[PDB]
């Protein structure tokens, strides 16, 4: 007999929910049946209790049930995502978006989920738009983009219209909640591999748990400097997910010869400034931003290699770094972005 | 510059707020500038972080600044309230309301803050209405009632119209929050003494701290059976507020000769049934309901005595118990209710 008083009371008592209660709540939210006060109370209470992977799995699974899917047999079995929670508070260039282009240029199919800025100056979607990429395509044209260009972009508001009540509440209250975890967990193309950034150190493990219950090869990553990306300024924590299990480890890019960078060297600006940074990297400019892009692209290539799991961790990294660099140095990435822009103009 | 993201982020980080932040939030809420989502997020976050006396003091002070006051010089310096949070989830007769009548009949001015039921079958206000008492009077008439009858009732929605945004959110989410503490702390007549029940054991101390900052003479009470009243079924915890400090006590009514009652002996029903229980007690019927009323009335009289605090605890209780018993057995309590009903009927 589920209800808001029952579910909110359990959370405010600091108890995990019974199985199915988070799903009930999320379905009320997604069908327009929850009052904004109830949505907010639920989001905050779940956040302060500390959500479990089972609970977040219910939230994401319900949200996916209401999403627009891509057409049958249009997403390759080995498609990868590169996306994070955001909310790291650091205002960087768009590392995930740049890595995604590089990964696609390396020959790995990419279906990227993304959205505009929430609290940074330019989000991945804003920057793609400033580059001339069409961010607003429906299921059929995202599938065509993927088939014709090797990359597609699923704009969250276009694919998750029923999330609008939750989204408005998120904007009204501003504070990060458990809802900030859901974007990376609800890519409507349901790719089985991903490099997934988490700004919230204590929730990365929960996100990894969600992925472990799916048929997935994922690196969930948190930079020990706070970034929702693999960082070049220090070590990162990685939760490797494969075969239904998790392997937590400390990762140090100095092992691959990367110089230690400063956070300010990765600083971004508005959409035009961040778009310029994309073009600079794809044109071969050497430096800290490139290094961070190559590191993250390699990470996504390692996640992808985990699907057809021949190679071991270290060799997979060495190959990922070689492929990511070559994709830039040979012009493939610059060429792939141009092709993606062309595709959107030819629609 | 205070803001929702700032304030809510601090609470979700499990930090106490900076001075002024809770006041800002409450002023947004009281002016209609807070979205329902913001109100709910704040109420829940403040609850799960665990509110401090300073924070609740800010909420209550802002709320009072928006309330209708009584007219100047109409509330005696020694007026008392008898009121609790409710939310104990035990169906009982209206113990605070009955005690309030008995206290007034003992010659202690009572200005009661109250409201309808939120969870229970009949709240104080509902039962008073069933007895024929006019509960919906403005400031001038509550003042007149206090003067002519010895008791007045401030009906919370009449005195706190700007709380309507918060009250709506409270109903929508159902779960108890820090807002459930505010009733007893926002009596618009500002009596300086009271017997204040708290259903939430871990928050009684916080409520006591707010009264300590006001230098009120107050007993904040929680029955160890969960009641937001002094109980007769077992011991109670009392946070005694005197001279601006709080000390915590275990109270056992057995020491005053009270037999242990069972919770079902205090069971209530709808407004008509609880009105009958009131009439039975005031007519002098013995038994567990009278015992509980007498105990709580004495507690309020003890709090009142603490305003002139040469207050040896056990003798204060002994005199309080005697005064409450006499107020019933002389007929004064039954007579006072009749006077109160008469006053309301004269208004037309
Ligand atoms: O404004 P914030 O909350 O900090 O978030 C900044 C971006 O991070 C996330 O995207 P993603 O990882 O796809 O993009 P990026 O790493 O390329 O910016 C999010 O969807 C935003 O677009
Ligand atoms: O429905 P609940 O949330 O359980 O609350 C029951 C009653 O308790 C409070 O009043 P008070 O202590 O003034 O009244 P009483 O006479 O019923 O004790 C509250 O305003 C309700 O009238
Ligand atoms: C950020 C986000 C994601 C999905 C949505 N439906 C919306 C929305 O409707 O505003 C917003
Ligand atoms: C408890 C309480 C206090 C003031 C109100 N206006 C309301 C209300 O509008 O329902 C409720
Ligand atoms: Mg990112
Ligand atoms: Mg980032
Ligand atoms: Mg009461
Ligand atoms: Mg009670």
UniProtKB/Swiss-Prot annotation, chain B:
Domain of life: Bacteria
Cofactor note: Binds 2 magnesium ions per monomer.
Keyword annotations: Amino-acid biosynthesis, Aromatic amino acid biosynthesis, Glycosyltransferase, Magnesium, Metal-binding, Transferase, Tryptophan biosynthesis
Membrane spanning residue stretches: none
EC number of the protein: 2.4.2.18
Disulphide connectivity of cysteines: none
Keyword Amino-acid biosynthesis part of the UniProt annotation: yes
Pathway in which this enzyme or protein is active: Amino-acid biosynthesis; L-tryptophan biosynthesis; L-tryptophan from chorismate: step 2/5
Residue positions binding anthranilate 2: 170
GO molecular function: anthranilate phosphoribosyltransferase activity; magnesium ion binding
GO cellular component assignments: cytosol
Residues that coordinate or bind anthranilate 1: 84, 115
Amino-acid positions noted as binding Mg(2+) 2 in the UniProt annotation, renumbered to this chain: 228-229
UniProt xrefs under SUPFAM superfamilies: Nucleoside phosphorylase/phosphoribosyltransferase catalytic domain, Nucleoside phosphorylase/phosphoribosyltransferase N-terminal domain
Binding site for Mg(2+) 1: 96, 229
Protein name: Anthranilate phosphoribosyltransferase
Species, as recorded: Mycobacterium tuberculosis (strain CDC 1551 / Oshkosh)
